[PDB]
Each structure stands twice: as C-alpha cells, then as structure tokens.
Amino acid sequence: MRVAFSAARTSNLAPGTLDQPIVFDLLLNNLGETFDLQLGRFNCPVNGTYVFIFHMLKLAVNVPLYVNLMKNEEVLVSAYANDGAPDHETASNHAILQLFQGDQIWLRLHRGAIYGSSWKYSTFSGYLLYQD
Amino acid sequence: RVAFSAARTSNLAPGTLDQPIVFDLLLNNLGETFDLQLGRFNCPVNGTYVFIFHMLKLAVNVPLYVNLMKNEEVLVSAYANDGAPDHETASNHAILQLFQGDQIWLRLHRGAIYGSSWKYSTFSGYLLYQD
Amino acid sequence: RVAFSAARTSNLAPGTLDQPIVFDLLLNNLGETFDLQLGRFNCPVNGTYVFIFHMLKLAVNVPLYVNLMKNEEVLVSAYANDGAPDHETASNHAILQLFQGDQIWLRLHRGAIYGSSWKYSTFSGYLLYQDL
Ligand SMILES: [Ca+2]
Ligand SMILES: [Ca+2]
C-alpha cells in the first residue's frame, strides 16, 4: 500500500488530567488518510510493518515531560524530558512494529505539557514500511 | 531510489542569524541528490519523502535553533539549550510530499553546531513512495 | 525485507568503557537479523539501511556517550548530560550502504543507560533498498 502521516502542534497542549491523548492541529502529510488530527490517532488500514517517530518539546516550566507511544491500550515505547532552569526540552523516540488492521497508534501525554508554534517543534509521524 | 546522509565534522559558528547548515561529509548519497557545499537536497522525482536531523550544539550559553526548510518556508523546528553550559541536541523529523525541483535544507537560526569525526550532527532523507 | 526494533527494560551500567549495548527484548525482528544477547545487527544482503536510536541516561553526573558502530568503526555518535543530575537522551540516526556480513551495533562509550518496562532506550533498523 501507501500509508504515511506527519502531524504537528501549532498551539500549546496543557491537559487538565494526566494520561490524555496528544491531539494535533496540523497535518504536514496524510497519505492514505489514516490519521485523525482531532483524536490524534493513527488507524492502521492493513496488516504490515510500520515505523513511528515523534519529537515533543515541553513547556519551559518545572514539570517533567513523560510521553508514551501507545498501541491501543499498551505502552510501546516512552520518552522523557526535563530541565530544571526551567528550559524547553525535547522528548523523542521511535518504534518499528508489526500491526494488524484496526490497531490504533497514538501519543499519550502521561505528565507535563507540550509547546506549539508555527515553527512546529512538536511532531508525530508514521508510515508503512512493508505490507503483510 | 533516493537517499542521503550527511554529517558535520568541524564546528559551525557563523556569527549571524539564519545561515544554511552546510555539511562536509557524506555518509550516503544514493541518487546524488544532495549538494554538500550547499547543504541542499534537490528533489529528483515527485513523491513522499522522509527527513531526520540531529544537531549537537556547542557547550556555550546560547540556545540552538534549527529549522528544516522547504524552499524558503520553515517546516519543522528544533530547539536545544543547557545553562551549565553543556552540549545539547536539537532534533526533529518530517514526512512530506515533494514536487520535483523542491529543495530541503537545514537553517541555523541561532546558535552554533559541534562537529567532529564522531559525527554528532547529522541530516538524512530518503524517498518513501514514488509519484 | 529486514527490520528490527530493540529496547532495554533494565539498567545498563557496565563498568568498563566502550562496551556493546545489549538489549533484552525485540519489538520486531523482520528477517531475523540482529541477536539480542550481543545487540548486533547482521547485514543479510547488500543494500541501503536506516538506523535510529534513543538512549536515556541514568540520573548521575556522568555524561552518556553512545556510538553507532559499523564493524569496528564509529559511524555517528550521540551525547547526553544534565548536571542536576537528571535523565537525558542521547539520540542519532544514519542511512548507509552495507555489504552482507557487515555488523551494526551500539557502543556505550561512557556513562550508563536507563531501562524500565516503559522502554525509553531503543535501537531500530530496516532495509531501505536492497542491492540486486
Ligand atoms: Ca536534551
Ligand atoms: Ca539540561
């Protein structure tokens, strides 16, 4: 197939509660129309091997940033960022995994808050490497 | 078939804002689309492309700001700073539909970049899907 | 078709400099390249390969230095340090032409790597273009 998305935050995301989905407000790309910006979720259209990458810039405040890459309800990989000045800092990670159709991939803001601007520091992408 | 991977092996500390990040070592250039002296990727065919970069800043108390550029537009950005002062890494990625002739490059908005033979500061891109 | 994704779920604080980063779980191993106990990717066919890694350091004031190695050579490197001390992330990537039999692996030059069930410390690679 052909599946690829790239989303960014152009405004701050500061959730009321812990463990909320990171939703996005700008698509850089949505080849295959698999990503929903308003839920921040990737909906796997076909069984195959997929790559995901994300970079999240934290607010310059004295709260650490914890981000999980989620597969449905499971933690796949996580990222951490914190600076005590306080300064902005970047939580990043990646994953390559076999998915089944209907699987949902998303970013969970476990703790902290994420910076957004037109310069788009905070990003989330994925694509299909191998079908099957 | 398109893929490049470039590295900085000596420091880049321009003095002024908004300079192009030029590279002095190619780890890869399948398709010969990257100009080292220019630090520019020249899109050879319409398609979906992936880019990734990691920039290590100098151990100085001036923040590092880097933009991934599409032609003259800022696409995604990265920030890094530590007040100790210590080295720190500005990184991001993007997946984009490009048209032939489009140019992708890194802009050093502010700050300075560390370069050595161990190659901390890198920039790569490749063709995901043709058309 | 080749792709692997590995993570560390327990800490790695070797003792000696320049030790191989070994992993304890594969998130994927399409093509059954890469062995867990050595932490090495065994190139199965001539071609172009992409590698990416994220290493979270222990919160100690010893800097983390990581090398991506091709056989016995340093390809690209990552650095992370925070003087608080706080956890921090060493990350990099590379795209390179390989020959079959070439070995790709991560070297812990200095420092220590954090591992937990949340998987902050990861290493993946996949085949971009096979050489026919
Ligand atoms: Ca950092
Ligand atoms: Ca810091």
Swiss-Prot record, chain C:
It is found in: Cell membrane. Detected in all tissues tested with highest levels of expression in brain and spleen. Changing residue 95 to S: Impaired homotrimer formation. No effect on LRP6 binding although LRP6 phosphorylation is significantly reduced. Ca(2+) 1 binds at residue 82. It comes from the Eukaryota. Ca(2+) 2 binds at residue 88. Changing residue 126 to S: No effect on homotrimer formation. Signal peptide: none annotated. The C1q domain is essential for the function in Wnt signaling. Belongs to the caprin family. Promotes phosphorylation of the Wnt coreceptor LRP6, leading to increased activity of the canonical Wnt signaling pathway. Facilitates constitutive LRP6 phosphorylation by CDK14/CCNY during G2/M stage of the cell cycle, which may potentiate cells for Wnt signaling. May regulate the transport and translation of mRNAs, modulating for instance the expression of proteins involved in synaptic plasticity in neurons. Involved in regulation of growth as erythroblasts shift from a highly proliferative state towards their terminal phase of differentiation. May be involved in apoptosis. This is Caprin-2. The gene is CAPRIN2.
